[PDB]
Paper text:
Reasoning that reduced thermal stability and poor crystal packing may explain the lack of structural information for hTREX1, we screened each hTREX1 chimera for the ability for form protein crystals. We identified conditions for the growth of hTREX1 Chi 2, Chi 3.1, Chi 4.1, and Chi 5.1 crystals and determined three crystal structures (hTREX1 Chi 3.1, Chi 4.1, and Chi 5.1).
TREX1 is a cytosolic DNA nuclease essential for regulation of cGAS-STING immune signaling. Human TREX1 is a 3′-to-5′ exonuclease composed of an N-terminal DNase catalytic domain (amino acids 1–242) and an unstructured C-terminus (amino acids 243–314) implicated in membrane targeting. Loss of TREX1 function results in accumulation of cytosolic DNA, inappropriate activation of cGAS-STING signaling, and severe autoimmunity. The overall structure of hTREX1 adopts the homodimeric conformation previously defined for mTREX1 with enzymatic active sites on opposite outer faces of the dimer.
Author numbering:
A (entry chain A), B (entry chain A): 6 to 46, 54 to 166, 174 to 236
Amino acid sequence: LPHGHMQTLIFLDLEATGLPSSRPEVTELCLLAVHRRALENPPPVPRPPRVVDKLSLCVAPGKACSPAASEITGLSTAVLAAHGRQCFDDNLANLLLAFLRRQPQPWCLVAHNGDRYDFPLLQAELAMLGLTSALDGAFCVDSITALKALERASRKSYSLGSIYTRLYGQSPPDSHTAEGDVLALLSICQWRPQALLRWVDAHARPFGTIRPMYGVT
Amino acid sequence: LPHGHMQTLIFLDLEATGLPSSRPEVTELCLLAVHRRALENPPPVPRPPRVVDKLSLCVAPGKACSPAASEITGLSTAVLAAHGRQCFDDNLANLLLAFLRRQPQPWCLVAHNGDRYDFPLLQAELAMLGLTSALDGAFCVDSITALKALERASRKSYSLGSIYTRLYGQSPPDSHTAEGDVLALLSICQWRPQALLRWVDAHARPFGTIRPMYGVT
């Protein structure tokens, strides 16, 4: 194991104003911290663990949401401003780090398509604030890569809804809201928990090696 | 209005090791921040607003949970320790304040039986850390007093489950978990949202006037 056994899996999802090439900005985020103990034990959807830490926040972006983004997430810059949401700032970064500091280390962020979207976007927002190494103590894995390895070890789509529906026979409840996507990802990761933990431990990647989607590197 | 219109209602619930006379310690907490805009519009349960901030955390108490507490909340000091939960510390207090700083002011904490339990207990945990004025910028109301005034304005129990069942014809889903109790309280406060906001604005009480359940005053 490159960095030992991960103690806490922090399932993560970011919603934003658009796609990577549009220089997107976070509109919503959810972090759900689950200790390794909770993952050490047609079918029914597994129940979430009793002991979990959860953080869900809406963020006012510095730009307009694309029509597709508002259609998908139900959020817009006007709606976020009507609720007095604040931009991505130092206080938000301090909040995220304080949330992670509640969790036993090593931390491992888990996000669906995180290597291409969630992780670079989070690094980009931190880079704009000059907090380039704020979350360097954490590790991260992409659950798309994880679930591909698990299912193939025993063509399919490996989107969040495709895997969820393929395993449990129904679509996840609250699709394309940060918390709903995190809870659906947790349910899928509870399918084969021990096999997931083995894969996460072997593929845990330092968050500092994640290049930001934009901004200084 | 004593302190103007409240901008953000932060629904709050604390779970602990026991009753006030036992010097209880927090085992779980949930904060759900809802801007006033979201409350400005047999019956079905109202849907929660799209734009909400949520924080749910489990806390390792410095003592054992009473059998009744573990029976009710599903938590115990051993279970919390098995998941590596940390005690109520400076980092947790910084986290709570950073969460509130995401919300437009004035802040108004809302808790069922908060005047007798949730508010004094939170003040007690902060007082043990010497952070006696950490949340002094916030206001607070007890939703038991609020819902009594609303229903009487048009003998009943005014417990969370009694009001919820009386209004919506069923019991709340996740009873006696911090997040479940907060979501049930939100649904009840959405019954007559405009009347609730009028009552909250007139009865908003500075959190600094809340005496701690124990510790230095």
